[PDB]
Amino acid sequence: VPIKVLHEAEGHIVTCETNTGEVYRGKLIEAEDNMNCQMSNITVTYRDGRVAQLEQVYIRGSKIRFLI
């Protein structure tokens, strides 16, 4: 039921942790086969806590390990 939980999380803003170690929070619009989702309002800390803003970010599923 994880795919239905991921499909039910659309339209909201959630945070996630990168596989390198970074953390980013944003709101997704579309999802891909390999979890290469497109999201906006990305508050990218750039793996050091320095907050930066991004929009319409399409990040592959290999970069982000799990939600946070």
Partner: protein, 63 residues
């Protein structure tokens, strides 16, 4: 193996694996997440006009 879920003919940046990045206009996607970039400016800005990026090193692209 499919194309990305974002289709594109607009100025956007893309940080690759290892910390490298490009900034240019997208031309198209591939099944192995390979992208074609026109006027790719390096964000680390050298350009060669046309750039081909494989999806194995592709990490995160943002507008």
């Amino acid at each position: 193996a499919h194309p990305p879920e974002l289709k594109m003919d607009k100025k956007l940046s893309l940080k690759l694996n290892g910390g490298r990045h490009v900034q240019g206009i997208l031309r198209g996607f591939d099944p192995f997440m390979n992208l074609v970039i026109d006027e790719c400016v390096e964000m680390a800005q050298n350009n060669i006009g046309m750039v081909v990026i494989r999806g194995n090193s592709i990490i995160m692209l943002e507008a």
